[PDB]
CSV table of C-alpha atoms and ligand atoms in Angstrom, one decimal:
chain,number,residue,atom,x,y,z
C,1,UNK,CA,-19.7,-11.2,-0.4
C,2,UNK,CA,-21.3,-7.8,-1.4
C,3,UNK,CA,-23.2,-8.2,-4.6
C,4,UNK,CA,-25.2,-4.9,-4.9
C,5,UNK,CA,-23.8,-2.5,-8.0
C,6,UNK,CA,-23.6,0.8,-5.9
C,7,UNK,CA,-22.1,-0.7,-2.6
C,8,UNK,CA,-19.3,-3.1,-4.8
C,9,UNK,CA,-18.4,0.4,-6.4
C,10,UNK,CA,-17.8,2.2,-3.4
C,11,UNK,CA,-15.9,-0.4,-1.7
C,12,UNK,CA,-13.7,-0.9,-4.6
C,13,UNK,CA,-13.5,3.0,-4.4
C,14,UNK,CA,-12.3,2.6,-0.9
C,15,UNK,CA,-10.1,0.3,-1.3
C,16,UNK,CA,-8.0,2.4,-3.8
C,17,UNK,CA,-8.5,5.0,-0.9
C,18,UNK,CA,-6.9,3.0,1.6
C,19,UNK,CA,-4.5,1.4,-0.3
C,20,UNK,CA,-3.0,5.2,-1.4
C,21,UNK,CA,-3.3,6.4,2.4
C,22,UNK,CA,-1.0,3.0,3.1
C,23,UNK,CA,1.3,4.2,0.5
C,24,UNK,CA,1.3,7.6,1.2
C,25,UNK,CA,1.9,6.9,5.0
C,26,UNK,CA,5.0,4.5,3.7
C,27,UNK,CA,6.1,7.0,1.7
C,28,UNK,CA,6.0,9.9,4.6
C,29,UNK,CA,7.6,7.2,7.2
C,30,UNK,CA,10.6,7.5,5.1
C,31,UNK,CA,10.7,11.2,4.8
C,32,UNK,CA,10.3,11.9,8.5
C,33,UNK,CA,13.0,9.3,9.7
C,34,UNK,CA,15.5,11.1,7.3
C,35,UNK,CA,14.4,14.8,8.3
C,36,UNK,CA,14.6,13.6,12.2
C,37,UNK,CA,11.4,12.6,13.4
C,38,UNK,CA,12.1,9.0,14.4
C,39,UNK,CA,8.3,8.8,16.3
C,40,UNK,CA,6.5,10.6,14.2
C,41,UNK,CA,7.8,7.7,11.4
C,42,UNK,CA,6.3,5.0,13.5
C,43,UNK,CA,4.0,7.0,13.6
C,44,UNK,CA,3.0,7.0,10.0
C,45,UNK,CA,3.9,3.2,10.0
C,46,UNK,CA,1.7,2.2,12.1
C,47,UNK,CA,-1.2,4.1,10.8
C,48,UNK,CA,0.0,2.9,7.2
C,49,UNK,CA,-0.6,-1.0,9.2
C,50,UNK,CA,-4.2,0.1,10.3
C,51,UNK,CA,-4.6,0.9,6.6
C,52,UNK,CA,-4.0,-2.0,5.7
C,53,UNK,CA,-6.4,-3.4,7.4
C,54,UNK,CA,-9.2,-1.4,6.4
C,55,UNK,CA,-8.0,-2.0,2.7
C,56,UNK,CA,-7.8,-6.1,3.6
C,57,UNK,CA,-11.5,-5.9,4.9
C,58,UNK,CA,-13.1,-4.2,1.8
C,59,UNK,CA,-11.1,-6.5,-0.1
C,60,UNK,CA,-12.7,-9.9,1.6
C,61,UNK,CA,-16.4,-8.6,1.7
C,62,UNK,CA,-15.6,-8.0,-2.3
C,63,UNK,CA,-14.7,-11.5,-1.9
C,64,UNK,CA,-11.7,-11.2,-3.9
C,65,UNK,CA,-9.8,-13.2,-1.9
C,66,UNK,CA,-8.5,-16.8,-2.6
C,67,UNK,CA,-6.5,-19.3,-2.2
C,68,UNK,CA,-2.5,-18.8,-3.3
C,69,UNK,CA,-3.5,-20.3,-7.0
C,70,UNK,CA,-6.0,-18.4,-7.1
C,71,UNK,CA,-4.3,-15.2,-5.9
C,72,UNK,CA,-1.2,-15.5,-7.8
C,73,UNK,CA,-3.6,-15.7,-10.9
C,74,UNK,CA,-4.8,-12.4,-10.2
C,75,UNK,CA,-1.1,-11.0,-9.7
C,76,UNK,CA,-0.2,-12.8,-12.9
C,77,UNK,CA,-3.4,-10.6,-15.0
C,78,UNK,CA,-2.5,-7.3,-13.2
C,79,UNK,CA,1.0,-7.9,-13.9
C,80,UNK,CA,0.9,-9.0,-17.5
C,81,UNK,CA,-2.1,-5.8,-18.0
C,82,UNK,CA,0.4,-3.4,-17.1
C,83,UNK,CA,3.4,-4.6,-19.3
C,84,UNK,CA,1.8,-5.0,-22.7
C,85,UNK,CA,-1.2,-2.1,-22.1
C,86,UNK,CA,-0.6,0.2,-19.7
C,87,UNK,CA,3.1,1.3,-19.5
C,88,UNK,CA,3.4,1.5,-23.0
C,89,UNK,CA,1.2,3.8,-23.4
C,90,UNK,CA,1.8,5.9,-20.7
C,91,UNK,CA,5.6,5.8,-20.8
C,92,UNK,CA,4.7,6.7,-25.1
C,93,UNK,CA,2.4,9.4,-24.0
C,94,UNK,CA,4.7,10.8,-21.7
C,95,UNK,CA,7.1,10.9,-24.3
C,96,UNK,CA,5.1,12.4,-27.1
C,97,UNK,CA,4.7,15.0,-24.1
C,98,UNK,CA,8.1,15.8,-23.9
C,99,UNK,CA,8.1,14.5,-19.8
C,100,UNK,CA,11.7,13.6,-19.1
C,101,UNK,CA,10.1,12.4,-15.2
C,102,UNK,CA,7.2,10.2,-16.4
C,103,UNK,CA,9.5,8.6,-18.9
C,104,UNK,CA,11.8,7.3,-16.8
C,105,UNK,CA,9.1,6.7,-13.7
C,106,UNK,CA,6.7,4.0,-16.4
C,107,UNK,CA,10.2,2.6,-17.8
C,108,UNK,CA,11.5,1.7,-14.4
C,109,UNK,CA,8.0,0.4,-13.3
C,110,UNK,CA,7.5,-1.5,-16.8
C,111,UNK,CA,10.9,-2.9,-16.9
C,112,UNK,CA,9.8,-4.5,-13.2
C,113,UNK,CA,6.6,-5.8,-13.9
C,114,UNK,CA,8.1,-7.9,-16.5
C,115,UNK,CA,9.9,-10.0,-13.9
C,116,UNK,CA,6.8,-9.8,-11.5
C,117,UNK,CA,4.6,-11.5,-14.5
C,118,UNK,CA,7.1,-14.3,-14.6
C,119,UNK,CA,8.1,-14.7,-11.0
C,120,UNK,CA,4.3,-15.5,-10.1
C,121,UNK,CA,3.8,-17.3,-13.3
C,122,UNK,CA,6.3,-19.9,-11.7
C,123,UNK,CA,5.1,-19.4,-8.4
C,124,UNK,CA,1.6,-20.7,-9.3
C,125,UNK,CA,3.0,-23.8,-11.1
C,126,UNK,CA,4.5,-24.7,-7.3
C,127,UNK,CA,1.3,-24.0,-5.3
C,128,UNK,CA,-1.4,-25.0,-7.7
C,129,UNK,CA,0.2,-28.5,-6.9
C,130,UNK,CA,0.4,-28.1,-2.9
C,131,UNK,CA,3.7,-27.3,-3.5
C,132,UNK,CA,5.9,-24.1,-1.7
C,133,UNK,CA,7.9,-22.7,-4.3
C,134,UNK,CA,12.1,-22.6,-3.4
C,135,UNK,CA,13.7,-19.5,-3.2
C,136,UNK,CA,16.8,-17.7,-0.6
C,137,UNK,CA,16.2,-14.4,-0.5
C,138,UNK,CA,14.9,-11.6,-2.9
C,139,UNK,CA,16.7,-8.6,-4.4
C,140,UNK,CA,14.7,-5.1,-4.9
C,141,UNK,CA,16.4,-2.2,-6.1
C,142,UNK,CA,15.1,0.8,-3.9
C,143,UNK,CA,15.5,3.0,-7.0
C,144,UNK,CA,13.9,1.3,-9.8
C,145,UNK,CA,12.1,-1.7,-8.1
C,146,UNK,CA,14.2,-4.0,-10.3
C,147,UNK,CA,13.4,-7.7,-8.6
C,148,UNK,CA,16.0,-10.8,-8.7
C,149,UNK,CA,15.4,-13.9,-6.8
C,150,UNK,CA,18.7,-15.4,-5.1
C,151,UNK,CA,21.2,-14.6,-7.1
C,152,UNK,CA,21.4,-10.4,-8.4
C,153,UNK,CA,24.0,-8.9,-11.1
C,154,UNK,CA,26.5,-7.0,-9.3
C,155,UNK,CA,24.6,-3.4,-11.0
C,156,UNK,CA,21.0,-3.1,-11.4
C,157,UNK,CA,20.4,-3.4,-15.3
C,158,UNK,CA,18.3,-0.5,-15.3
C,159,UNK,CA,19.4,2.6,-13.2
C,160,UNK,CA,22.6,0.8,-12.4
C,161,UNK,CA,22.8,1.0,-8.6
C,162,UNK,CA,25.4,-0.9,-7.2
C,163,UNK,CA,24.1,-4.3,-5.5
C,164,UNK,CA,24.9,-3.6,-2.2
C,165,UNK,CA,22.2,-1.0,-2.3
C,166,UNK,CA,19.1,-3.7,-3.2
C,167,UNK,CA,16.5,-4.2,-0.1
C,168,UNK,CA,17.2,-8.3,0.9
C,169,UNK,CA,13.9,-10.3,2.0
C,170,UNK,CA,15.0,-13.4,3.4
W,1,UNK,CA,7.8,18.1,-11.5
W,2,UNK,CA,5.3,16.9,-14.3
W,3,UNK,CA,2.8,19.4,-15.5
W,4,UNK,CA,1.2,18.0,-18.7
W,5,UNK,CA,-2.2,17.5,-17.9
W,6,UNK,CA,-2.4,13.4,-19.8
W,7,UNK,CA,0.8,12.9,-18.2
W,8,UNK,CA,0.4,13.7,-15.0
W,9,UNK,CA,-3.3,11.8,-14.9
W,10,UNK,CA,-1.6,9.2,-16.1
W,11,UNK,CA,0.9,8.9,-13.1
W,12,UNK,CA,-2.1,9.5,-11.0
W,13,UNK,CA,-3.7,6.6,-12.3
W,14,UNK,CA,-0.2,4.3,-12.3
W,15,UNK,CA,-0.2,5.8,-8.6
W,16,UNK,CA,-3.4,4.2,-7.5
W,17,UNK,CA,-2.6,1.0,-9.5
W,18,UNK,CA,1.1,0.4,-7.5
W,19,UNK,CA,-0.6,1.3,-5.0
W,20,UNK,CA,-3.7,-1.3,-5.1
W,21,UNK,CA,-1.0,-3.7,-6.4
W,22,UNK,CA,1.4,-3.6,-3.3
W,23,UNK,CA,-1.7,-3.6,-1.0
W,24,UNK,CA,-3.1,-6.4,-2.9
W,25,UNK,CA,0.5,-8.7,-2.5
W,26,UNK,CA,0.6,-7.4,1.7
W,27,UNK,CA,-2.5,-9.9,1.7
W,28,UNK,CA,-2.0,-12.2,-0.7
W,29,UNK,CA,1.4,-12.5,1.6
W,30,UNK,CA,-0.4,-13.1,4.7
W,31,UNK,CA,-2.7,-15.8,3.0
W,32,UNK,CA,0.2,-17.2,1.7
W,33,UNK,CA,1.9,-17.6,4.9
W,34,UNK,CA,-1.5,-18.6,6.4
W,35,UNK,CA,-1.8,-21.9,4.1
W,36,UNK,CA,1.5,-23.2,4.2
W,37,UNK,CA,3.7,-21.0,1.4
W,38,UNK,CA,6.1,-19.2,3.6
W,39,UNK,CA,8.6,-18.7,0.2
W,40,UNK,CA,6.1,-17.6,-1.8
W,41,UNK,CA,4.8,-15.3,1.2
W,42,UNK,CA,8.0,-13.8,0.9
W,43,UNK,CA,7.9,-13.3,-2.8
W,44,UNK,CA,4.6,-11.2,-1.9
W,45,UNK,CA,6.3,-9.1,0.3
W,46,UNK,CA,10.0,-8.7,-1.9
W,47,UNK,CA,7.6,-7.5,-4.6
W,48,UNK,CA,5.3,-5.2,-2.3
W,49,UNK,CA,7.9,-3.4,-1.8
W,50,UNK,CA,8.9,-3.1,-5.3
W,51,UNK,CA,5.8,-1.4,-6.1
W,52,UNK,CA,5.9,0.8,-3.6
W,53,UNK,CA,9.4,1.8,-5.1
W,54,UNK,CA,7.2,2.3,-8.4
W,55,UNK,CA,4.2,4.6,-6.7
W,56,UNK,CA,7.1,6.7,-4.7
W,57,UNK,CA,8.9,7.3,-7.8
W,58,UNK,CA,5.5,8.6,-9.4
W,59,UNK,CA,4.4,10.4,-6.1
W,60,UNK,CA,8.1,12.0,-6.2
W,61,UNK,CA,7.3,12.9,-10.0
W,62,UNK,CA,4.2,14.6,-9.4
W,63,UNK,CA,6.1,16.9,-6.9
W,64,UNK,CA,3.2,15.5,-3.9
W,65,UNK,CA,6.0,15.0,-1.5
W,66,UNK,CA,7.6,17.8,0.9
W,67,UNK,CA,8.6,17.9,4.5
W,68,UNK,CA,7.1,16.3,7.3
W,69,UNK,CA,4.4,19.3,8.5
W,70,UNK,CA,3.5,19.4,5.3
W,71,UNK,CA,3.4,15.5,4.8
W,72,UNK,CA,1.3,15.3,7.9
W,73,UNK,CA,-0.8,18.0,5.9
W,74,UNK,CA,-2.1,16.1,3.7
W,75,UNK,CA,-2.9,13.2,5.7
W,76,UNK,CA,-4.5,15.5,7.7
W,77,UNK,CA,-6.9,16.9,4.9
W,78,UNK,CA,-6.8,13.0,4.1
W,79,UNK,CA,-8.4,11.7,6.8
W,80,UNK,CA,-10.8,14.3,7.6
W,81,UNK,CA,-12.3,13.6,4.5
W,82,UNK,CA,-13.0,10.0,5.3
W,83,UNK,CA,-14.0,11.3,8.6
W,84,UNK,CA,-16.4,13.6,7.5
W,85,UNK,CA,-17.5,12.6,3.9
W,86,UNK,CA,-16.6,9.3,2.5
W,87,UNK,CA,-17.4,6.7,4.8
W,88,UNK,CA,-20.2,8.1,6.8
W,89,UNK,CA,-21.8,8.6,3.4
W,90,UNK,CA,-20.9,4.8,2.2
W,91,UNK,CA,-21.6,3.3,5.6
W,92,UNK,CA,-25.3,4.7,5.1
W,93,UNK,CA,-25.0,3.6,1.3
W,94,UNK,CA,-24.1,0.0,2.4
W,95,UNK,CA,-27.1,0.6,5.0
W,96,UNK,CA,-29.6,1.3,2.7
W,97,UNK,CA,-29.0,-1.5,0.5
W,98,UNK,CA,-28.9,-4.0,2.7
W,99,UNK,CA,-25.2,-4.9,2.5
W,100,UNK,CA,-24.3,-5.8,6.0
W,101,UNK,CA,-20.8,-6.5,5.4
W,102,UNK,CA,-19.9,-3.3,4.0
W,103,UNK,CA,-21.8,-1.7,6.7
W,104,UNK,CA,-19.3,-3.4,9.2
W,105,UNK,CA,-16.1,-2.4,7.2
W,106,UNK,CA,-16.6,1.0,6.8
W,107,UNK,CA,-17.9,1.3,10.2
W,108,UNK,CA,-14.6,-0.1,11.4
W,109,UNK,CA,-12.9,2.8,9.2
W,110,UNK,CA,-14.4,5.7,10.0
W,111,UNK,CA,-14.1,5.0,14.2
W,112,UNK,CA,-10.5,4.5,13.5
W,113,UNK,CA,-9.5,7.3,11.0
W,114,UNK,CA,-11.2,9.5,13.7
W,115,UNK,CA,-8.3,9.1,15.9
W,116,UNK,CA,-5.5,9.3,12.7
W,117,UNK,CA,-6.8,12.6,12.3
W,118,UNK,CA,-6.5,13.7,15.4
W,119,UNK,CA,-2.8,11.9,16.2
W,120,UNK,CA,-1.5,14.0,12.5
W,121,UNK,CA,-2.8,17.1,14.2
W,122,UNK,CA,-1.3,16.8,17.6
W,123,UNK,CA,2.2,15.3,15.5
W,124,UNK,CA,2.2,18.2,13.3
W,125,UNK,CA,1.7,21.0,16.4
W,126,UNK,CA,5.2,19.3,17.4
W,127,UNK,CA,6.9,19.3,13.8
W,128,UNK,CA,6.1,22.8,13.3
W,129,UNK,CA,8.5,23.7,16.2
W,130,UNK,CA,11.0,21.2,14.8
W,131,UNK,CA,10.2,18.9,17.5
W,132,UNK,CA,9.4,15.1,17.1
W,133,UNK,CA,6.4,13.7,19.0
W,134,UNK,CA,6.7,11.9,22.3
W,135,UNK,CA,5.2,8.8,21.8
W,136,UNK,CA,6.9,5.2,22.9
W,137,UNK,CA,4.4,2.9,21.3
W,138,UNK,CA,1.6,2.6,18.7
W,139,UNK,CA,-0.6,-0.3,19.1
W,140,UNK,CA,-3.1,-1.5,16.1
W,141,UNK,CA,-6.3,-3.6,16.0
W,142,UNK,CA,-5.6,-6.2,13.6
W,143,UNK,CA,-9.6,-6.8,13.3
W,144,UNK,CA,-10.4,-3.3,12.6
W,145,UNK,CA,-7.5,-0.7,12.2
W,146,UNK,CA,-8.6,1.0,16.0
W,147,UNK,CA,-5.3,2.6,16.6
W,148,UNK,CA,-4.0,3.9,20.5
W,149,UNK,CA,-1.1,4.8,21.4
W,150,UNK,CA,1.6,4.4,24.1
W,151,UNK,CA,-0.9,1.7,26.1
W,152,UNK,CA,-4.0,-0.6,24.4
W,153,UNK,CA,-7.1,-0.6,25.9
W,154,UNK,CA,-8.4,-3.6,28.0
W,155,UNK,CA,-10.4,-4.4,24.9
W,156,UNK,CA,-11.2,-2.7,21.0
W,157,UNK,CA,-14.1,-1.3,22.0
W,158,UNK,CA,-15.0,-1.0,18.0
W,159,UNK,CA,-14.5,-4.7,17.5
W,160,UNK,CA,-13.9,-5.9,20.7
W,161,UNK,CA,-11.2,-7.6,20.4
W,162,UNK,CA,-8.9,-8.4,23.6
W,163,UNK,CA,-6.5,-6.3,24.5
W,164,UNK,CA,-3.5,-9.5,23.6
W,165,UNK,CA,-4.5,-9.0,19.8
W,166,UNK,CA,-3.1,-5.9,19.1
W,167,UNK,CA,-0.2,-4.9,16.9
W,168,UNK,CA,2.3,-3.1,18.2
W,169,UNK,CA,4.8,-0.5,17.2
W,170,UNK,CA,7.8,1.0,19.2
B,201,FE2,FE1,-8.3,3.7,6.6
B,202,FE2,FE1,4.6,-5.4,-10.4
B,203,FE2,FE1,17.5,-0.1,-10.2
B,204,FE2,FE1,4.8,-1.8,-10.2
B,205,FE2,FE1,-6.7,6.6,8.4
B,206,FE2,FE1,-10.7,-3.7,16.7
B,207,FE,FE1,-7.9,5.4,5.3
């Protein structure tokens, strides 16, 4: 694990470098299979994956990896950090400045990370105990992020997109 | 497109935290999978992909997303940076202080966003025209992000690994 000051910085640096190149590239994949550009999206898609691994390799020599408990812990912080302090404030801000855009961006994100907080909560009851935890399939709503495990209302509660539009993980 | 200066920080900061927060859950899902959680591996990934629902929506906000040349623009700019600035500059960092391990992941990095750079340029020659790029396959090192295309060589020859490790992407 790295422990000098200057080198944990920049590898935490690059880490949020990598991890927005990832995104970025995901985001781009998209764009260019809907414009018509079928190879250069798996193009971006696999260059997103070698991001990935950069960002997973910083990450280890951080040594902030764990075990699942340990792991789900850290999901369970982040999670809980950005419903009660972050999107607050940011969705409030965005409000005070009159930002229709951010308003509804940090609502649908906040509204999400509610059920994300949970979720793992629950999750980490299972594996701290050597146990899996027992769930189908999982519902995200591609417009909102709105998460359901199994069973999802016919509407998404918060942008109201019609169930057969959620992304199924199974 | 959001223009208030605190607002639009602000969804540049909630960018880079969806973003570090879906990268964070692709490798807590592949631990996950890795000691024996496969359900909660897939709660990882159902929820990865909600965030990066969440980082798209505040990418899309701040108006950063446009058409594939330009796309490929920006990851262009993107990688030349790392290229050229940050990692050679935090590989000698991470030299000078001793920190081997950072040394060896940013190493891996830089060799591999070398060829990214050049892959966006020769993509975005193509989009230009309105042509997509003719590529059949993308193969990735899993060890380091070394990234070929169409065939994998006989061996990384950053990390070394055999030829039988690598990702690929058609
Ligand atoms: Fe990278
Ligand atoms: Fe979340
Ligand atoms: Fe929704
Ligand atoms: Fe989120
Ligand atoms: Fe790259
Ligand atoms: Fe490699
Ligand atoms: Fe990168």
């Amino acid at each position: 694990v790295v422990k000098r000051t200057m080198t944990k910085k920049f590898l935490e640096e690059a880490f949020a470098g990598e991890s927005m190149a990832h995104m970025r590239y995901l985001i781009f994949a998209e764009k260019a299979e809907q414009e018509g550009f079928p190879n250069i999206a798996k193009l971006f898609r696999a260059i997103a994956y070698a991001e990935f691994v950069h960002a997973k390799n910083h990450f280890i020599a951080l040594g902030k990896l764990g075990k699942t408990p340990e792991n789900l812990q850290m999901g369970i912080e982040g999670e809980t950090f950005e419903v009660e302090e972050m999107y607050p404030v940011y969705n409030k801000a965005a409000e005070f400045q009159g930002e229709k855009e951010a308003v509804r961006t940090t609502h649908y994100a906040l509204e999400a990370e509610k059920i994300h907080a949970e979720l793992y909560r629950k999750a980490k009851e299972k594996a701290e105990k050597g146990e899996d935890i027992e769930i189908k399939k999982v519902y995200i709503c591609p417009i909102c992020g709105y998460t359901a495990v199994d069973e999802a209302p016919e509407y998404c509660p918060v942008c109201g997109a019609p169930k057969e539009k959620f992304v199924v993980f199974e």
